[PDB]
Design a protein around this nucleic acid. Structure first.
Ligand SMILES: [Mg+2]
Ligand SMILES: [Mg+2]
Ligand SMILES: [Mg+2]
Ligand SMILES: [Mg+2]
Ligand SMILES: [Mg+2]
Ligand SMILES: [Mg+2]
Ligand SMILES: [Mg+2]
Ligand SMILES: [Mg+2]
Ligand SMILES: [Mg+2]
Ligand SMILES: [Mg+2]
Ligand SMILES: [Mg+2]
Ligand SMILES: [Mg+2]
Ligand SMILES: [Mg+2]
Ligand SMILES: [Mg+2]
Ligand SMILES: [Mg+2]
Ligand SMILES: [Mg+2]
Ligand SMILES: [Zn+2]
Ligand SMILES: [Zn+2]
Ligand SMILES: [Zn+2]
Ligand SMILES: [Zn+2]
Lengths: 149, 64, 65, 198, 194, 129, 95
RNA sequence: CUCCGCGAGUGGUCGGGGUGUUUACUGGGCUUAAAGCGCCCGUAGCCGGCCCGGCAAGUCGCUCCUGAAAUCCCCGGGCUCAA
RNA sequence: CCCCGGAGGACCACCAGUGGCGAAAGCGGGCGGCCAGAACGCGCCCGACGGUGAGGGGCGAAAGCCGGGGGAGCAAAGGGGAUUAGAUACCCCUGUAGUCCCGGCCGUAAACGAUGCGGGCUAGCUGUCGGUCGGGCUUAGGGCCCGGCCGGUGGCGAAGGGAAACC
């Protein structure tokens, strides 16, 4: 839910106050960009790509080493998502919930979860239309947006 | 702060770490520094109840 | 974590650790709280297993960065 | 660091044994030193010694007659008794009569300028009257004690008979030395063991 | 009189000759005789007198509850309450408690429509409260007078205040609570961190 | 959701002063908070002001001198004129010699005394006494 | 005026309770607000001299719980009307 | 009978303001006194993180053209003062 | 009453708690599948995208209504046996809707924490739940104990507040 939740957690990562390049790093900025483009072509989304760089390759953060952001690097290197990552995730979640609701029409909890997800989709669409990252004629039609699932 | 206001009456003892005055009908506590005994330590009843620490201006002792 | 208004300078509680793979002997840099199965880049064996907290290491811990 | 009494005597009397509770106040002050894997709180014995020294200097500056030393703990009846017999202070073991400091029309109406309670969590009535009248208060506090209205505290194991007897003997010796009837070398006429109650 | 309580001993021995020193050094007055010794010019007034009853099997047992305000008219005021079966000792008890509860009152100017540096009014804006009567005292220009209720005027005049503006809230018809709230504000003049 | 850092910082200072603390830590901060603290320190209500460079915008550690009797941010931020300063003076302060209003003007954040000296007006921010 | 901070039942952060049926009754209440007094219980008490260690006669005891509403809990003396100060005392209900 | 208040006035009933912090901007309250919609999604509206650069709309300062006269506040003068 | 078999409808005893989940209503046997929403850990991604929300909505106990199925126990209405001055009640026997399932309507409740939602600051002590970190042990287990943080859930209680109960 969004309002009147039972709990209000604090879980989040605490980064250094001003991140810098690690002294122990064995990867140059250009090699970091090629590794990111490799993971993108393999198909991981940007959050997963960042986790992969941090875990497997020991890259703490793309921004200090390269001066850019991960989606900026992917955009420069010929990788352009259809929609923004969070909006696409919300739309896929809504499509999965609707597919479930097709065979289970009396799942009122699932209907409320779908309403929450669709409201989040609407807020994100309002923001993206305001900032120009999506076309101003974009409309959330789940029947015509099945291809994104 | 205060600009040329001459406020009457007895002045109150001032708390030596918070400036909470020992008001009439409320009894604070005034003693000498336990480590030295040179400076005076004044604790209003609020600071005594709250356990507010006090520091000697002369020595480096912090007491209840 | 704690409250940002209570901690003076918040810092990352995790750390980066160098590992030596026991099979081949390659050294690798790896996040301590690895949220995935981290493998050796050469032989391919598993070096770190993910948990809900600090990851479990199968390779020798050469030094914590 | 140089001790009022030897560390073997201290750690045999168990003065630095605290209750297994929590006390964020004492922890922030730094009187808590180490907690074992069974949850037992251990004080800093060096801080214990330094607070004994400063406390002895505190009681030394007051006339002994105007200092009231009180406990309701029966374990502290005897150590406070010999401490106070050797210093010359209004002593009180047993029940603190309410209104002794606030009711001047009472037969036992004492007038004091310093109060010394063995345990403030049990000797609450004396602490309450001291707060109401504005009398300075000294207390042998541990993890369970409430710190309100205590102008001076000595974090120590105020439960055991051995700890109480050793602490009171050390305080009596230091107060005698500060008053001047004893130089810094002599000891009391009786050992610490006579302070321990029976 | 026997100087019961050691402060009374010093006061009768003349080591303390003025009432200002007690409130300067935070000394607690436990006896009224110190007050009559150090303030011979103390005027006491009967602010309120209510009849009060307890129900019992044989009928109500009545007791007078008298409220008394004592003051020197020079910055010293106190108010006390006395319950007694008869009015005379009720007033005596109230006078004794007022004398025990006497306190200094800080005075001065501070009104925007005045510039005199005299003790005619309160030095700053102060508040007091007793149960539900809240009384805010505000400094006023000289010559305005006491702009409070009647019992508030009596308490302020006894405390030695000439001009003031009042702002009250709650049932002021509770005369005891109104008097206590006004006295509370006058005592709260000393809680201001100058 | 956090709305006004100035009112948040002022009420935090008031809470710490009520509890009789020696220092209050102020997070998040802005230049308005810094200039308000500067005016308070200039008039003595607030002691030393140390900046802390945490990554999340900065923090201010302020020393308290036992001088505040009541503090608070006037909200809404009312536009006040030089001829209108005095009624807000009487509205928020006790005594004609005690306390100060804080004003944001085109020459910067200052006290109501300095605003009346410069013969200017502006936006009311807070009060101290 | 609100008697008790418990609402008369230690229910917990929930909206509805499964609720039970009273013994010798049926007025009753949910799982909380009911009395669940336990007794040791055994058939034929003190015949252990004339049975048990005679013949072979192996007996059994069965701890038994009885559930009562407030009316029956007051009626069989399992609950008294304690004073206001003693209302917050934590005592076990005689097993 | 005598005393009290105002007096060429003094009373009755109405309407407005005060009363009234009982309309609350200053400045009320909503556990139990009247008062939190059974719960949640969200449109308009209102309220909104930090830093830097531009503008100068709100805002602030001065000035000008104005906001009829009478009325209102201050000052001087003339009706014997007064109005 | 006891035994041997079959059929049917409801519920999920103890464990079990001011224990958990959920926005509220509400949710208590096991296994499986399909979903949802949180907490915790994180040098993951976006970069203010947020709050509240008139109007407008959607969900919403019990009883009740519409149509279909089912019906063990209980049981409004009703019948009978008692009691009483009366007894159209309270007690006993019995008994139909209803209670259960499916589709819809109803849209109410002491729908209550009688406490709108969001965020910050302000002593503590103590039980318990989830995650996580440090130490010790180990029914060597996803285990137990102590200490810290984060997030819930109870108790007492600083400052403060209140007409007071009290928070
Ligand atoms: Mg919006
Ligand atoms: Mg514990
Ligand atoms: Mg309910
Ligand atoms: Mg009202
Ligand atoms: Mg009501
Ligand atoms: Mg509600
Ligand atoms: Mg309604
Ligand atoms: Mg309703
Ligand atoms: Mg402009
Ligand atoms: Mg909303
Ligand atoms: Mg609506
Ligand atoms: Mg139904
Ligand atoms: Mg039937
Ligand atoms: Mg039947
Ligand atoms: Mg309600
Ligand atoms: Mg109320
Ligand atoms: Zn010193
Ligand atoms: Zn390898
Ligand atoms: Zn004046
Ligand atoms: Zn029953």
């Amino acid at each position: 839910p969004h309002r009147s939740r039972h709990k209000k957690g604090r879980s989040s990562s605490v980064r250094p106050p001003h991140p810098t390049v690690p002294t122990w790093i064995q990867y140059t900025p250009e090699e970091v960009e090629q590794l990111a483009v490799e993971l993108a072509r393999r198909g991981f989304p940007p959050s997963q790509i960042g986790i992969i760089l941090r875990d497997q390759y020991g890259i703490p953060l793309v921004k200090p080493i390269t001066g850019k952001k991960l989606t900026k690097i992917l955009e420069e290197h010929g990788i352009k998502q259809e929609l923004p990552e969070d909006l696409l995730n919300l739309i896929r979640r809504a499509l999965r919930i609707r597919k479930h609701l097709e065979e289970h029409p009396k799942d009122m909890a699932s209907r409320r979860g779908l309403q929450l997800v669709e409201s989040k989709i609407h807020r994100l669409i309002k923001y993206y239309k305001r900032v120009g990252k999506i076309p101003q004629d974009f409309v959330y039609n789940p029947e015509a947006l099945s291809h994104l699932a | 702060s205060i600009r040329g206001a001459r406020i009457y009456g007895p002045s109150p003892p001032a708390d030596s770490t918070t400036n909470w005055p020992l008001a009439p009908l409320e009894r604070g506590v005034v003693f000498a520094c336990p480590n030295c005994g040179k400076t005076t330590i004044v604790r209003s009843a609020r600071a005594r109840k709250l356990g507010v620490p006090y520091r000697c201006p002369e020595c480096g002792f912090v007491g209840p | 974590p704690q409250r940002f208004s209570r901690v003076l300078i918040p810092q990352p509680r995790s750390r980066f650790v160098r590992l030596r793979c026991p099979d081949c002997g390659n050294e690798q840099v790896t996040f301590s709280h690895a949220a995935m199965v981290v493998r050796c880049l050469v032989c391919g064996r598993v070096l770190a297993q993910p948990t809900g907290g600090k990851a479990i290491f199968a390779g020798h811990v050469v030094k914590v960065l | 660091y140089e001790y009022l009494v030897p560390l073997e005597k201290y750690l045999s009397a168990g003065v630095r044994l605290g209750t297994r509770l929590s006390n964020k106040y004492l922890e922030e002050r730094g009187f808590i030193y180490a907690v074992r894997p069974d949850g037992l709180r251990i004080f800093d014995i060096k801080k214990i010694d330094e607070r004994l020294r400063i406390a002895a200097k505190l009681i030394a500056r007051y006339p002994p007659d105007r200092v009231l030393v009180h406990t309701t703990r029966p374990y502290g009846f005897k150590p406070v008794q010999m401490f106070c017999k050797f210093v010359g202070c209004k002593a009180l073991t047993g029940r603190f009569i309410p209104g002794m400091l606030t009711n001047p029309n009472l037969s036992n109406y004492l007038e004091v300028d310093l109060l010394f309670v063995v345990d403030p969590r049990l000797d609450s009535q004396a602490v309450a009257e001291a707060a109401k009248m504005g009398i300075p208060v000294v207390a042998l506090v541990d993890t369970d004690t409430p710190h309100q209205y205590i102008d001076f505290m000595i974090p120590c194991n105020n439960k055991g008979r051995k700890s109480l007897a050793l602490i009171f003997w050390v305080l009596a010796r230091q107060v005698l030395r500060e008053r001047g009837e004893l130089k810094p070398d002599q000891d009391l006429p009786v050992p610490p063991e006579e302070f321990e109650t029976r | 009189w026997e100087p019961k309580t050691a402060l009374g001993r010093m006061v009768k021995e003349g080591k303390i000759r003025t009432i200002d020193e007690i409130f300067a050094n935070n000394l607690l007055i436990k006896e009224p005789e110190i007050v009559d010794i150090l303030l011979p010019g103390l005027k006491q007034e009967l602010l309120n007198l209510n009849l009060v009853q307890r129900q019992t099997h044989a009928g109500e047992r009545n007791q007078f509850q008298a409220v008394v305000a004592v003051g020197n008219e020079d910055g010293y005021v106190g108010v006390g309450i006395g319950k007694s079966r008869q009015v005379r000792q009720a007033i005596e008890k109230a006078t004794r408690e007022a004398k025990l509860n006497i306190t200094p009152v800080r005075r001065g100017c501070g009104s925007w429509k005045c510039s005199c540096d005299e003790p005619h009014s309160v030095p700053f804006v102060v508040s007091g409260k007793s149960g539900s009567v809240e009384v805010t005292l505000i400094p006023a220009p000289k010559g305005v007078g006491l702009v409070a209720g009647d019992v508030a005027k009596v308490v302020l005049r006894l405390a030695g205040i000439k001009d003031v503006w009042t702002k009250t809230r709650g049932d002021t018809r509770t005369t005891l609570n109104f008097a206590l709230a006004v006295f509370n504000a006058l005592r709260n003049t000393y809680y201001f961190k100058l | 959701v956090m709305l006004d850092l100035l009112s948040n910082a002022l009420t935090a200072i008031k809470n710490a002063e009520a509890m009789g603390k020696r220092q209050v830590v102020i997070w998040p901060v802005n230049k308005l908070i810094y200039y308000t603290l500067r005016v308070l320190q200039r008039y003595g209500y607030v002691g030393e002001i140390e900046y802390i460079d945490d990554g999340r915008g900065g923090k201010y550690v302020v020393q308290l001198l036992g001088k505040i009797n009541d503090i608070g941010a006037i909200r809404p931020r009312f536009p006040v004129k030089y001829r209108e300063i005095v009624e807000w003076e009487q509205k928020y302060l006790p005594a004609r010699q005690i306390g100060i209003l804080v004003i944001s003007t085109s020459q910067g954040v200052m006290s109501h005394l300095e605003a009346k000296e410069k013969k200017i007006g502006g936006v009311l921010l807070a009060y101290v006494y | 005026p609100k008697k008790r901070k418990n609402r008369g039942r230690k229910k917990g952060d929930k909206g509805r309770e499964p609720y039970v049926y009273c013994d010798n009754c049926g007025k009753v209440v949910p799982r909380s607000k009911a009395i669940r007094l336990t007794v040791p219980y055994s058939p034929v008490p003190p015949d252990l001299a004339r049975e048990l260690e005679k013949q072979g006669a192996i007996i059994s005891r069965y701890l038994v719980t009885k559930t009562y509403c407030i009316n029956c809990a007051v009626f069989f003396g399992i609950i008294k009307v304690r004073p206001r100060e003693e209302r917050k005392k934590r005592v076990p209900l005689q097993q």
